[PDB]
Design brief:
Strand content of chain B: under 5%
Order of helices and strands of chain B: HHHHHHHHHHHHHHHHH
Structural class of chain B: mainly alpha
Helix content of chain A: 40-55%
Distance between the termini of chain B: 71 Å
Shape of chain A: elongated
Oligomer: heterotetramer
Shape of chain B: globular
Main location (chains B, D): cytoplasm
Helix content of chain B: over 70%
Order of helices and strands of chain A: HHHHEEHHHHHHHEEEE
Number of domains of chain B: 1
CATH architecture of chain B: Alpha Horseshoe
GO biological process, one term (chains B, D): protein localization to axon
Number of helices of chain B: 17
Number of domains of chain A: 1
Largest interface: A-B, 56 and 74 residues
Strand content of chain A: under 5%
Strand order of the largest sheet of chain A: 1-2
GO molecular function, one term (chains B, D): structural molecule activity
Number of strands of chain A: 6
Radius of gyration of chain B: 20 Å
Radius of gyration of chain A: 27 Å
Subunit structure (chains B, D): Oligomeric complex that consists of at least the alpha, beta, beta', gamma, delta, epsilon and zeta subunits.
Largest sheet of chain A: 2 strands, antiparallel
Protein name (chains B, D): Coatomer subunit epsilon
CATH superfamily of chain B: Tetratricopeptide repeat domain
Structural class of chain A: mainly alpha
CATH topology of chain B: Serine Threonine Protein Phosphatase 5, Tetratricopeptide repeat
Chain lengths: ~325, ~290, ~325, ~290
């Protein structure tokens, strides 16, 4: 706090067409490490490099819609002089203080836009349109790494949202496969019940877990596995179903307790935590080896390491990655 | 005072029909002004894509300034002839040009800009001394992302005539590119010209771009809708609505409608070609991470 | 000149403890309207009333040192009889002819005491200790209304001294704020240059105005505002700087004249007199409305009327007052 | 001639140890004088703040004049007992006093003056007939700013004994309060007593006060420094140096040193309490112009 270096006088250091300056889309890339900013910039290769190292994408085909529509919202356009090629504007999110070199592009997808879309996903699920719910869920899932987010709590929510989309996508995948399988053999019916029981350990909303417990309760009651069916009934009742289903469930329960015997040994452990292999639909019990999706948390039995995750449809099972990046916070 | 003030003003803000109407009414108080009026009359027909008017009515006996508009009309109208016109244009410029004929230099530079040759266009404009020559230089320097050089040429216009329409317009273009506090400056310039004259497609999107830059998407929606009602085919409106749509949370089927609508804008805005290029860049990069 | 009224004979007009006579400190208050005399008298309320009406003081907190130390020099003390409470003496300035009723207290702060302290203020400024110079300058400033002064020319000097302390205090206040501001944005650097240029219109000693022109010359040269920077250089050179700075300045000037163009429109008018708002540090151009400090002459933009002057730290911006009183002359 | 002349003189000019030394040497040429000597011996111990000597050695068998000194010794020594002593003193005076016992009246009036009760002290002194009773009346009237009444009592002393030490001292106090040409009169009285006897703390500040009153600050600096060397704790020196310091342009850190030094003068001079009061008056008035 003297007079300073602000007071010291320093060293002063045809027709030629000028050369281009850096474009504002290149400024975006220099100043940002978030995939959505590079996509808005039109730099698809650098965007893909970022998604690859951070979140594990290798099959980018299923990203084409997101990428291209994102690209299209990146620049405004306005005409200067008549009959000459129009100008482009590059709206920045930090526009008040962006200047020449520090800009970084406006935010076009917010986390709550995605949280709102969860509702149409839930409705679609409730009414049974599983193929359309999975499609809508996966879109939310792949969209999360295109977010830009302010604080540590939104990074938390964005992760929970991914986990929600995963839970639904693999659960519904189990149910859709259970419905494609034949129900002729006894051994075939045993396999169906198993899958209905695995679905019971998906972490869904209570209104949906009531439906999957109802499904598991029928199949295990028809199998004559009454000891395990009874506990599905007791768990269904504790979620608080609507009155008609409580009554149908109470009648099935008091019939189970009048004969609390399981007819068959199934491969389903009630008192033992597991994850659902999202490719073969068999349980992986918490100690045993797993390879995971580096973005969603989908679990796979180890045979599948290196393959394309069935949930996200774009990631590499078991790849080691930096982790999701969707905020300036994460670059201290 | 300039007898052609209303005529030139209507043209530069994109009010081409008002230019055409007011050019046909003014009284012939010179032969110098007489030719100057005709130049704007015909450049307005160019701007309306009515190249047949320009091409039929400018004859080999017509004034040199009009020959220059007709040259540009040929290029815009006849895609097959463009490379040969540019070849001849290079030969003219290398041989000898009347430097006082600013109309010829703006028509030369207009052709080069379309031919994606800004060096040639700046080389031509460098030779002229006129306000539109500077204004066109400001625009080209802004496209070259040389906002530093643009500011110096704009400063030239500000010292010569602060209140001129080209100077205001150049101030808005320079401000739209500088950002920050200056975006509001640009907005009011575009607004002030809309509410003295008439709110043309050019001024409507001009204003919308200043809103969108400050993140004020909802304030921009009125302007783009008004522009859409006037002319369903003006491309800059369609592009801006793609941006605005997404920032307002609308469904991707809306962005898709504006993309299909933009293929029939039949005005040659680069956006669709760059979009298809980015379609191809993406398809190519997908196969780089997974060679099927 | 007859025999007169001096010759006419006129009308001749237990144990009780006597009553007190008026104290000599009360005699002081009766005979004087100058703040320092009432402070020496121990009459702080009447002293404050005088400073309020004359010079505009409302926040008297920052006067505590001056008041109390002044009070302590007011009376001498001497012991009369052993083992009894001592006596007090009340030295008068007009002691030769004071008598019982006309006394007025001795003078303990002279104008030249203050003019001498200006030098340590100047040195502190030259070496860069702005916070300590401002403190020392404000002390001189608040001390001026505690003077007692003989003739009209000393009233003039005491006013110029106030004006000197003001000029320095607001100037240094500009520089200290310029140094606290960020220099990241272009718009941020534009604001810094403006302030450096405002400081150039403070009326300081030539040796100090050379330093502020040097500062303005760097900042405007780094901004690439060469037309305005050149005139700072021509003005710096005309004050007659030491040889090394002339050479650094001449080299910066002939570089400016080889490109005499300003890159940016700043809010600084070379050919237009203004005053510096001593609270917001923006220019007030001589015609526009101002509210002033009634003691120092610090100018403020009108929003601040009624607030505590940032320069003196004790006065009310825009209050109408009698004016400084520091001499018997002013009570004809 | 008075056998106790040197003894009383040493006391009244503040040369207490010389009083004590010369009281212990004089030969007992009476029992009346014997008690009178002891009174000054013990008042000198009071003046040296050695109340233990006075309190231990004056017994209930001691002469009435000594009981009066011991009463005063109790009051100065025992703050907790002061209100009760004064209560008893009021009862004595209202009951019956030996009016010829001037030593008792001066001890009564001494107590009242400390108890901030000049009416009572004057009421007691009124009853006595002696030179110190008048001299003490002159001092109290001067503190009451009744220089008119003081002059009349001083005139009484001047007619009775011009050359007495109390009369000279009273003349100096009266002159120091009259000012003008009389300040020089007081100075020479203080000087003449210093250069016959010894320059005590009391005479040194006496002289300095006469210089400071005529504005002769530099002539006062020698005297105060000499007083400071003799006794770092005599408060009147410290107060006078605060005045002198500022009139000589010294830094406020000097006035501050003398203020902190005065808190440990451990002699009960009112200056610090009045200073702290003025600290409180100021804090209170600040909030009156700006109630935070």
């Amino acid at each position: 706090e003297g007079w300073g270096e602000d007071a010291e006088l320093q060293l002063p250091p045809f027709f030629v067409p000028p050369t281009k300056g850096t474009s504002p889309t290149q400024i975006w890339c220099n100043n940002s490490q978030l995939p959505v900013d590079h996509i808005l910039a039109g730099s698809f290769e650098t965007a893909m490099r970022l998604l690859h190292d951070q979140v594990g994408v290798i099959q980018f085909g299923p990203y084409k819609q997101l990428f291209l529509q994102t690209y299209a919202r990146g620049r405004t356009t306005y005409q200067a002089l008549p009959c000459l090629p129009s100008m482009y504007g590059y709206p920045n999110r930090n526009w008040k203080d962006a200047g020449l070199k520090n800009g970084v592009p406006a935010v076009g997808l917010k986390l709550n836009d995605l949280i709102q879309r969860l509702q149409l996903c839930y409705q679609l699920t409730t009414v049974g349109k599983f193929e359309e719910a999975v499609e809508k869920f996966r879109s939310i899932l792949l969209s999360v790494p295109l977010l830009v987010v302010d604080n540590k709590q939104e990074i938390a929510e964005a992760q929970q949202l991914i986990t929600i989309c995963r839970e639904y996508i693999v659960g519904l995948s189990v149910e859709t496969e259970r419905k494609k399988l034949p129900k002729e053999t006894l051994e075939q019916q045993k396999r169906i019940c198993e899958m209905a029981a695995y679905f019971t350990h998906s972490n869904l909303q209570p209104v949906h877990m009531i439906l999957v417990l109802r499904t598991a309760l029928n199949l295990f009651f028809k199998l004559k596995n009454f000891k395990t069916a009874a506990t599905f009934a007791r768990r269904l009742l504790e979620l608080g179903p609507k009155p008609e289903v409580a009554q149908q469930t109470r009648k099935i329960l008091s019939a189970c307790e009048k004969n609390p015997t399981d007819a068959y040994q199934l491969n389903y452990d009630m008192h033992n935590p597991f994850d659902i292999c999202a490719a073969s639909y068999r349980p992986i019990y918490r100690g045993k080896p797993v390879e995971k999706c580096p973005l969603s948390g989908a679990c796979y039995s180890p045979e599948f390491k290196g393959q394309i995750c069935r949930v996200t449809t774009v990631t590499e099972i078991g790849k080691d990655v930096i982790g999701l990046r969707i905020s300036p916070l994460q670059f201290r | 005072v300039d007898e052609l003030f209303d005529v030139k003003n209507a043209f530069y803000i994109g009010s081409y029909q008002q230019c055409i109407n007011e050019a046909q009414r003014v009284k012939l108080s010179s032969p110098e002004r007489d030719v100057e009026r005709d130049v704007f009359l015909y450049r307005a027909y160019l701007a309306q894509r009515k190249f047949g008017v320009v091409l039929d009515e400018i004859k080999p006996s017509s004034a040199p300034e009009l020959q220059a508009v007709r040259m540009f009309a040929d290029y815009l109208a006849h895609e097959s002839r463009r490379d040969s016109i540019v070849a001849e244009l290079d030969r003219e410029m290398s041989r000898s040009v009347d430097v006082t004929n600013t109309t010829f230099l703006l028509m030369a530079a207009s052709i080069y800009l379309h031919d994606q040759n800004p060096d040639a266009a700046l080389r031509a404009l460098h030779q002229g001394d006129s306000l539109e020559c500077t204004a066109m230089t400001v625009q080209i320097l802004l496209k070259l992302d040389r906002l530093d050089l643009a500011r110096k040429e704009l400063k030239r216009m500000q010292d010569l005539d602060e209140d001129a329409t080209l100077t205001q317009l150049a101030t808005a273009w320079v401000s739209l590119a500088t950002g920050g506090e200056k975006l509001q400056d640009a907005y009011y310039i575009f607004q002030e010209m809309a509410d003295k004259c008439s709110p043309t497609l050019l001024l409507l999107n001009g204003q919308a771009a200043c809103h969108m830059a400050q993140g004020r998407w909802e304030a921009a929606e009125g302007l783009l809708q008004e522009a859409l009602d006037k002319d369903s085919g003006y491309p800059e409106t369609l592009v801006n609505l793609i941006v605005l749509s997404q920032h307002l949370g609308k469904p991707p089927e809306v962005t898709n409608r504006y993309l299909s609508q933009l293929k029939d804008a039949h005005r040659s805005h680069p956006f669709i070609k760059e979009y298809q290029a980015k379609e191809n860049d993406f398809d190519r990069l997908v196969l780089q991470y997974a060679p099927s």
